[PDB]
Design a protein around this motif. Sequence first.
Motif, PDB file in Angstrom:
ATOM      1  N   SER A 102      -7.067  -7.759  -4.068  1.00 46.82           N
ATOM      2  CA  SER A 102      -5.745  -7.158  -3.610  1.00 46.82           C
ATOM      3  C   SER A 102      -5.110  -5.530  -3.895  1.00 46.82           C
ATOM      4  O   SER A 102      -5.038  -4.380  -3.558  1.00 46.82           O
ATOM      5  CB  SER A 102      -5.075  -8.018  -2.661  1.00 46.82           C
ATOM      6  OG  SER A 102      -3.904  -8.344  -3.718  1.00 46.82           O
TER       7      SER A 102
ATOM      8  N   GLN B 285     -10.339  -7.925   2.401  1.00 47.16           N
ATOM      9  CA  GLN B 285      -8.760  -7.692   0.656  1.00 47.16           C
ATOM     10  C   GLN B 285      -9.645  -9.352  -0.534  1.00 47.16           C
ATOM     11  O   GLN B 285      -9.512 -10.267   0.669  1.00 47.16           O
ATOM     12  CB  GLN B 285      -7.767  -8.327   0.791  1.00 47.16           C
ATOM     13  CG  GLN B 285      -7.158  -6.679   1.135  1.00 47.16           C
ATOM     14  CD  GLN B 285      -6.002  -6.366   1.792  1.00 47.16           C
ATOM     15  OE1 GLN B 285      -4.901  -7.957   2.135  1.00 47.16           O
ATOM     16  NE2 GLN B 285      -6.025  -5.529   2.769  1.00 47.16           N
TER      17      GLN B 285
ATOM     18  N   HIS C 276       6.477  -7.582  11.876  1.00 45.48           N
ATOM     19  CA  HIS C 276       4.691  -7.590  10.932  1.00 45.48           C
ATOM     20  C   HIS C 276       4.571  -8.362  10.372  1.00 45.48           C
ATOM     21  O   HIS C 276       3.174  -8.998   9.998  1.00 45.48           O
ATOM     22  CB  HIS C 276       5.050  -6.662  10.678  1.00 45.48           C
ATOM     23  CG  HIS C 276       4.347  -5.687   9.411  1.00 45.48           C
ATOM     24  ND1 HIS C 276       2.817  -4.903   9.976  1.00 45.48           N
ATOM     25  CD2 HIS C 276       3.738  -6.367   8.852  1.00 45.48           C
ATOM     26  CE1 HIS C 276       2.270  -4.377   9.372  1.00 45.48           C
ATOM     27  NE2 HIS C 276       2.891  -5.521   8.434  1.00 45.48           N
TER      28      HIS C 276
ATOM     29  N   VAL D 192       7.162   4.261  13.272  1.00 43.37           N
ATOM     30  CA  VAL D 192       5.952   5.125  13.761  1.00 43.37           C
ATOM     31  C   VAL D 192       5.913   5.004  15.571  1.00 43.37           C
ATOM     32  O   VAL D 192       5.026   4.292  15.102  1.00 43.37           O
ATOM     33  CB  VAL D 192       5.158   5.648  12.529  1.00 43.37           C
ATOM     34  CG1 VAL D 192       4.028   6.882  13.178  1.00 43.37           C
ATOM     35  CG2 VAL D 192       6.067   5.825  11.224  1.00 43.37           C
TER      36      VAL D 192
ATOM     37  N   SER E  22       1.071  -1.080  -0.423  1.00 45.69           N
ATOM     38  CA  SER E  22       0.034  -0.446   0.090  1.00 45.69           C
ATOM     39  C   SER E  22       0.436   1.145  -0.601  1.00 45.69           C
ATOM     40  O   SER E  22       0.656   1.584  -0.761  1.00 45.69           O
ATOM     41  CB  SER E  22      -1.252   0.016   1.133  1.00 45.69           C
ATOM     42  OG  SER E  22      -1.802  -1.161   1.423  1.00 45.69           O
TER      43      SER E  22
ATOM     44  N   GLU F 200       9.192   2.835   7.554  1.00 42.34           N
ATOM     45  CA  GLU F 200       8.904   1.800   7.077  1.00 42.34           C
ATOM     46  C   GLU F 200      10.040   0.991   8.694  1.00 42.34           C
ATOM     47  O   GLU F 200      11.059   1.538   9.068  1.00 42.34           O
ATOM     48  CB  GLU F 200       9.535   1.236   5.884  1.00 42.34           C
ATOM     49  CG  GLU F 200       9.078  -0.364   5.864  1.00 42.34           C
ATOM     50  CD  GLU F 200       8.349  -1.148   6.494  1.00 42.34           C
ATOM     51  OE1 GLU F 200       7.585  -0.588   5.602  1.00 42.34           O
ATOM     52  OE2 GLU F 200       8.721  -1.799   7.590  1.00 42.34           O
TER      53      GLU F 200
HETATM   54  C1  LIG Z   1      -0.556 -14.775   5.816  1.00 40.47           C
HETATM   55  C2  LIG Z   1      -0.439 -13.804   4.557  1.00 40.47           C
HETATM   56  C3  LIG Z   1      -1.004 -14.056   3.486  1.00 40.47           C
HETATM   57  C4  LIG Z   1      -1.671 -13.471   2.163  1.00 40.47           C
HETATM   58  N1  LIG Z   1      -1.161 -13.744   1.130  1.00 40.47           N
HETATM   59  C5  LIG Z   1      -1.895 -12.919   0.398  1.00 40.47           C
HETATM   60  C6  LIG Z   1      -2.320 -13.773  -1.168  1.00 40.47           C
HETATM   61  O1  LIG Z   1      -1.813 -14.376  -1.417  1.00 40.47           O
HETATM   62  N2  LIG Z   1      -2.890 -12.877  -1.976  1.00 40.47           N
HETATM   63  C7  LIG Z   1      -3.463 -11.399  -1.829  1.00 40.47           C
HETATM   64  O2  LIG Z   1      -3.239 -10.682  -2.469  1.00 40.47           O
HETATM   65  N3  LIG Z   1      -3.501 -10.651  -0.192  1.00 40.47           N
HETATM   66  C8  LIG Z   1      -2.508 -11.903   0.254  1.00 40.47           C
HETATM   67  N4  LIG Z   1      -2.464 -11.147   2.082  1.00 40.47           N
HETATM   68  C9  LIG Z   1      -3.208  -9.816   1.978  1.00 40.47           C
HETATM   69  C10 LIG Z   1      -2.244  -8.533   2.454  1.00 40.47           C
HETATM   70  O3  LIG Z   1      -2.938  -8.457   3.221  1.00 40.47           O
HETATM   71  C11 LIG Z   1      -2.217  -7.632   1.141  1.00 40.47           C
HETATM   72  O4  LIG Z   1      -1.347  -9.381   0.498  1.00 40.47           O
HETATM   73  C12 LIG Z   1      -1.114  -6.821   0.864  1.00 40.47           C
HETATM   74  O5  LIG Z   1       0.206  -7.496   1.588  1.00 40.47           O
HETATM   75  C13 LIG Z   1      -1.673  -5.820   1.768  1.00 40.47           C
HETATM   76  O6  LIG Z   1       0.020  -4.877   1.988  1.00 40.47           O
HETATM   77  P1  LIG Z   1      -0.063  -3.406   2.831  1.00 40.47           P
HETATM   78  O7  LIG Z   1       0.865  -2.437   2.731  1.00 40.47           O
HETATM   79  O8  LIG Z   1      -1.556  -2.715   2.945  1.00 40.47           O
HETATM   80  O9  LIG Z   1      -0.026  -3.954   4.890  1.00 40.47           O
HETATM   81  P2  LIG Z   1       1.751  -4.377   5.031  1.00 40.47           P
HETATM   82  O10 LIG Z   1       1.990  -5.318   3.360  1.00 40.47           O
HETATM   83  O11 LIG Z   1       0.756  -5.256   6.348  1.00 40.47           O
HETATM   84  O12 LIG Z   1       2.161  -3.820   4.891  1.00 40.47           O
HETATM   85  C14 LIG Z   1       1.625  -2.431   6.222  1.00 40.47           C
HETATM   86  C15 LIG Z   1       3.183  -2.058   6.168  1.00 40.47           C
HETATM   87  O13 LIG Z   1       3.247  -0.641   7.224  1.00 40.47           O
HETATM   88  C16 LIG Z   1       4.835  -1.154   8.138  1.00 40.47           C
HETATM   89  N5  LIG Z   1       4.239  -1.054   9.162  1.00 40.47           N
HETATM   90  C17 LIG Z   1       3.556  -0.971  10.440  1.00 40.47           C
HETATM   91  N6  LIG Z   1       3.506  -0.782  10.841  1.00 40.47           N
HETATM   92  C18 LIG Z   1       4.726   0.124  11.286  1.00 40.47           C
HETATM   93  C19 LIG Z   1       5.158   1.788  12.491  1.00 40.47           C
HETATM   94  N7  LIG Z   1       4.187   1.000  13.158  1.00 40.47           N
HETATM   95  N8  LIG Z   1       6.124   2.936  11.414  1.00 40.47           N
HETATM   96  C20 LIG Z   1       6.820   2.394  10.735  1.00 40.47           C
HETATM   97  N9  LIG Z   1       5.729   1.470   9.580  1.00 40.47           N
HETATM   98  C21 LIG Z   1       4.756   0.407  10.178  1.00 40.47           C
HETATM   99  C22 LIG Z   1       4.708  -2.484   8.454  1.00 40.47           C
HETATM  100  O14 LIG Z   1       6.184  -3.132   8.478  1.00 40.47           O
HETATM  101  C23 LIG Z   1       4.564  -3.187   6.650  1.00 40.47           C
HETATM  102  O15 LIG Z   1       5.796  -2.596   5.813  1.00 40.47           O
HETATM  103  C24 LIG Z   1      -1.884 -12.004   2.596  1.00 40.47           C
HETATM  104  C25 LIG Z   1      -1.765 -11.692   4.101  1.00 40.47           C
HETATM  105  C26 LIG Z   1      -1.453 -12.220   5.245  1.00 40.47           C
HETATM  106  C27 LIG Z   1      -0.623 -11.872   6.503  1.00 40.47           C
END
Ligand SMILES: Cc1cc2nc3c(=O)[nH]c(=O)nc-3n(C[C@H](O)[C@H](O)[C@H](O)COP(=O)(O)OP(=O)(O)OC[C@H]3O[C@@H](n4cnc5c(N)ncnc54)[C@H](O)[C@@H]3O)c2cc1C
Lengths: 446, 446
Positions: A320, A317, A62, A125, A12, A37
Motif C-alpha cells: 500500500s 492493495q 470518507h 472537488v 496517496s 481535500e
Molecule cells: C477500513 C479500512 C482499513 C484499512 N486498513 C489498512 C491497513 O491496515 N493497512 C493497509 O496497508 N491498508 C489499509 N487500508 C487500505 C487503504 O486503501 C490504504 O491504507 C490507504 O488509505 C490508501 O489511501 P489513499 O490516499 O490512496 O486513499 P484514501 O486513504 O481513501 O484517501 C483519499 C482522500 O481523498 C479525499 N477525497 C475524496 N474525494 C474527494 C473530493 N471530492 N474532494 C476532495 N477530497 C476528496 C478523501 O477525503 C481522502 O482524504 C484500509 C482501508 C479501509 C477502507
Amino acid sequence: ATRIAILGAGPSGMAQLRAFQSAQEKGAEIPELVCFEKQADWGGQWNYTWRTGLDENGEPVHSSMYRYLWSSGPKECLEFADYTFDEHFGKPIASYPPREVLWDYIKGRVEKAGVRKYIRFNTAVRHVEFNEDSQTFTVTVQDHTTDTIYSAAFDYVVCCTGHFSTPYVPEFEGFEKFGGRILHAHDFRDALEFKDKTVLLVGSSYSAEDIGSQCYKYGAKKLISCYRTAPMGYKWPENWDERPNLVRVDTENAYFADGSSEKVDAIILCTGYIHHFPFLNDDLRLVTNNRLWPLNLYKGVVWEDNPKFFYIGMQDQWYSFNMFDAQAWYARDVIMGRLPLPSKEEMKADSMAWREKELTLVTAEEMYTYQGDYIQNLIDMTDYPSFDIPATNKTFLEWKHHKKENIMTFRDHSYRSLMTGTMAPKHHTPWIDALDDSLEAYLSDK
Amino acid sequence: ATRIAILGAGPSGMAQLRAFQSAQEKGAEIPELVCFEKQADWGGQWNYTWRTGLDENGEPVHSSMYRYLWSSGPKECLEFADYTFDEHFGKPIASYPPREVLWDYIKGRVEKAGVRKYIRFNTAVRHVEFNEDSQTFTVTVQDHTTDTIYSAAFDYVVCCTGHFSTPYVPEFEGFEKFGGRILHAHDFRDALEFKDKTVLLVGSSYSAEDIGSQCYKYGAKKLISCYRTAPMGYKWPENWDERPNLVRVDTENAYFADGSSEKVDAIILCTGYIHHFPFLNDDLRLVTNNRLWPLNLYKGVVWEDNPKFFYIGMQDQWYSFNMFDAQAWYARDVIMGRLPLPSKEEMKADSMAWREKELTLVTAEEMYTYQGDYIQNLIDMTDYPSFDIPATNKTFLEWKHHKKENIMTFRDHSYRSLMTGTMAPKHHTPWIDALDDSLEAYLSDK
Ligand SMILES: Cc1cc2nc3c(=O)[nH]c(=O)nc-3n(C[C@H](O)[C@H](O)[C@H](O)COP(=O)(O)OP(=O)(O)OC[C@H]3O[C@@H](n4cnc5c(N)ncnc54)[C@H](O)[C@@H]3O)c2cc1C
Ligand SMILES: Cc1cc2nc3c(=O)[nH]c(=O)nc-3n(C[C@H](O)[C@H](O)[C@H](O)COP(=O)(O)OP(=O)(O)OC[C@H]3O[C@@H](n4cnc5c(N)ncnc54)[C@H](O)[C@@H]3O)c2cc1C
Ligand SMILES: NC(=O)c1ccc[n+]([C@@H]2O[C@H](COP(=O)([O-])OP(=O)(O)OC[C@H]3O[C@@H](n4cnc5c(N)ncnc54)[C@H](OP(=O)(O)O)[C@@H]3O)[C@@H](O)[C@H]2O)c1
Ligand SMILES: NC(=O)c1ccc[n+]([C@@H]2O[C@H](COP(=O)([O-])OP(=O)(O)OC[C@H]3O[C@@H](n4cnc5c(N)ncnc54)[C@H](OP(=O)(O)O)[C@@H]3O)[C@@H](O)[C@H]2O)c1
C-alpha cells in the motif's frame, strides 16, 4: 509557470506532495502545487471520524475506519523507503500498530517535508473538465470554510481520492421489514454498540474478518458470517459460525441457502466498495472493479485517453504505502519531463501484457508477488530508493501462515524491517487483551 | 421547440409535470419536458428506503422517512385542489394517514395524468451551467442504469430537489469516544432497533417530537430529549424528560447544562437540514437557512439573478402539497409567457416587502397565516382552483390545540376537507395501538 492539481490528501495525495518536495530538495525546479481535500485534516482513511453517511458540509463521509482498528498486515510491508519506522518513533515498536499510530507515522513524513502549505482543506472537488482549446484542466471546487464555489486552471491533475469509500451495498429480500439496524461496513464505528448482540456479517473478505473480530473482542453474544462463493475458512471462536449465503430476512430472522435460519439483531454488509468519481466525465472517469490491474492506466497510473491526468492507488492493495510512493514518484517524473510517455498504441500494448498476466493469478502468493513485480518495475525508473521486494513477498507469506495458524492471534507475531534490518519486539499486550486503541497506550508500556 | 428540465420527481417535481399536463389537457401547447430523478421511483421523501447514508449508486440517500411515520398535520391541509382524497380512495379515511397511504395518493394524481413518461429515473443531476452566448442551460447527469454521464441543453430549469435531505449534524465534545450509536434523524429507520434502550434525542422540533414518539410507541426503555433554546413544552409520557442542552459525552454518559447526566445507549441528532445543491455554481445556487421567506426568489419561486431558473418548495413547510402546486402553476405560467416578469429592481423590492413581513412573525398562528397569504397571492394569478385558505388556517389552529392538549393523541382527531366539505371518520384504531403502518392495514377495518 506549469501548475498541478492533486485531488485528496490521504496517503496517496501526501505521497504525491512528498515526491515533488523531494525532487525540489535535491535542487530540481518543480511545478506549482495545489492539493484539494474535503476533510479538515490529512490522512485519508486513517483520519478517524465518528461521523457516518454525510459529513458536516454534506459531502459523503470518507473514512471507513472504526474504533480499535489495527494494521491488517505487517507494518514492515508498508514502511516508507525514505522515512523509516525507526526515524519517526525513535525506537522499535510491534508489527501491527493501531490506526492512530500509523496515522501519526504518515503525517510525520509530510510534517517533516513541510508540504502542508500546498493543501486547501475543507474543499470538495466538484468537477474536473479538460479544455481542448487551451490543453488545460478546469478544476471546480467548493470551499466549505467560505461557502464559495470557484474554479482554477491546471496543466496536470493527479487523482488520489481512493476507492474504499463508496460502499457497494446489495439488497436482500426483506430488508424493508427487518427490525434491527442494517449498515454497510463503511458505517461501522464502535464495536461496543454490538455488545451482547447477534450480528450477521454478509461477506467473506477483510472487512468481514476484521469487523467480526472487533465485535467478538468487545463482547458480542454471537457472530454469523455468510459467504457468497467459498467460506473464509479460518478456525473461528466458539460463538462464531460461517453459513452459506443469506437469502432473505423478516422482522427478526435471517434465512440462509443452508436451509437454516436464526434470530439476528443487526446486519453488517461487508460487501466492498465501488470506484466512484462524481467529479469526472466519461473522458476522464476510471471505470473498474477492484483488482490488481485496472485497465486504461499506463504503468497503472497514467490515464491512457488523456495522459495529462493520473490516478494514484486505484489498484487493489496488498502493498500500500510504498506502492503509492512508487506510483507518485513515477507520476512526478512523467509530469516533470524526466520520463517521456510512449505513443498511445505502445501504452495499450504494455497494459494488455499486464492484464494477461493478472488473469493467470491463482494463489494469494502469486498475487502479492505480482504487485511486487509491478512495484519493482516502477521504482527502477525513478530515484525512489530501491528496497528488497522479494523479502517483502516473504514477509507477506509469513503473515498469510500466521493468519491460517490462528486468525485471532496473527497480530501478536513480529517481522523484520526491510529498510533497517532490525527485528520488531513483541508488543506489551496480546491482541485480545489490548482494549485501548490509543497511540499513548500503545507507545508507553503497561 | 422550447425545452424544460425538472430536477427531482418528489411532490414538487410531480406537481411541476402535473401543472404542464393540465395546461395541455385544456388545449394549450406546452414545452418539451424532461424530469431527472436519482431514485428508481417517484415520491421523494415519501418513497421509503431501508438504505442509509449512500444509495446503491453512491448517491447520498435521499429519503429521511422511517417505519411507522404518519402524516404530521391534518391531511385536510395538504389536499390537492384538483385531485381530492374522495376521488383517489373512493371513500372517507381518517385525518393522519401513514406514509404509504399518502405516497399512494400523490402517485395517484400523476398516474392519472400520465406524466411518468417524462421522467428518467435512476439519473443523478451532476451539474447545471448557464451558457451566456446561447442563453440556455447545460444539464449534466449520470444515468446509473447505463452508467453513462451525458448532458443536454434546456431553455428553463425548475429545481425540485428539496431541503430536508442533507442533514445538519453539529458536533459535541466526546462523540469520538462514545460507545453507542450516533446518528442523525435522517438515518433513523426502524424504531424497534431502540426497544429496551435509553435514547437521547438532541433537538426540539418535529423530528424530536416524532422520532421520540415512535421510540416510545415501539417500547424504548427511556427517552431524554434536550433543547438548545426553549423546551418543546408538551406533557410527555412518564419515561421521557426534557433537559437543557447536551454539553458533552464520554464512553457511556451524556452531560447536560442542567449539571445532570446519565447513561445513554444511542444518540439521535434531530438538528435539521441544510439547503445543499452540489450540482449548481454560485450564479444559480440558493443559499438560505430554513424559513418562511428565503431571499432571492421572486414570488418565492423565480431565481432573481437568472429568471429562467426556478425553485419549487424551498420554503419551510406548514402547507406543503398545495403550496408546491401553487408554486408549480406559477412557474408554469411564467415559463409559458402568460405572466411576464417585472424588471429586476421590482422583483427585489417585492421580495424585500415579503421579507419585512416575515420578520414580524411571532406566533405559530401568524406563521401559517403568512404562508397562506403567500399561497393566496399565487393561486389568484393562475387557473389553479382557488380554495378556502382562511378555513385551512383554522384547521391548522385546531391541530395546534390538539397537540398542546395531548402530544400522544393528536393523531386520533378528525377534520373536514376544504375541497369536498365532508368530515373525516375516526380511525378504526387509536394511534398508540396501530402498530402496523401498511396501506392495507390502514384501508381495511380492524
Ligand atoms: C477500513 C479500512 C482499513 C484499512 N486498513 C489498512 C491497513 O491496515 N493497512 C493497509 O496497508 N491498508 C489499509 N487500508 C487500505 C487503504 O486503501 C490504504 O491504507 C490507504 O488509505 C490508501 O489511501 P489513499 O490516499 O490512496 O486513499 P484514501 O486513504 O481513501 O484517501 C483519499 C482522500 O481523498 C479525499 N477525497 C475524496 N474525494 C474527494 C473530493 N471530492 N474532494 C476532495 N477530497 C476528496 C478523501 O477525503 C481522502 O482524504 C484500509 C482501508 C479501509 C477502507
Ligand atoms: C422525515 C420527514 C417527514 C415529513 N413528513 C411530512 C408530513 O407528514 N406532511 C407534510 O405535509 N410534509 C412532510 N414532510 C415535508 C416534505 O418536505 C414534503 O412533504 C415533500 O416531500 C416535499 O417534497 P419535494 O418534492 O419538494 O422534495 P422531496 O420530497 O425531498 O423530493 C425531492 C426529489 O429530488 C430528488 N433529487 C435530489 N437531488 C437529486 C439529484 N441530484 N439528481 C436527481 N434527483 C435528485 C430526490 O430523489 C427526490 O425524489 C416531511 C419531511 C421529512 C424529511
Ligand atoms: N485493518 C483491516 O483489517 C481492514 C479492514 C477492512 C478493510 N481493509 C482493506 O479494504 C480492502 C477490502 O475491504 P473489503 O473486505 O470490505 O471488500 P472486498 O475485499 O472486495 O471483499 C468484498 C467482499 O464482499 C463479498 N460480497 C460482494 N457482494 C456480495 C453479495 N451480493 N452477497 C454476499 N457477499 C458479497 C465478496 O464476496 P465474494 O468473495 O463472493 O466476491 C467479498 O467477500 C482490503 O484490501 C484492505 O486493504 C482492511
Ligand atoms: N411526519 C412527521 O412527523 C415529521 C417528522 C420529521 C420531520 N418532518 C418535517 O421536517 C421539517 C423539520 O424537520 P426538523 O424537526 O428535523 O428540523 P427543524 O424543523 O429545522 O428543527 C431544527 C431543530 O434542531 C435544533 N438544533 C439545531 N442545532 C442544534 C444544536 N447545535 N444543539 C441542539 N439542538 C439543535 C433546533 O434548535 P433551535 O430550536 O434552538 O433553533 C431545532 O429544534 C418540518 O417542517 C416537517 O415538515 C415531519
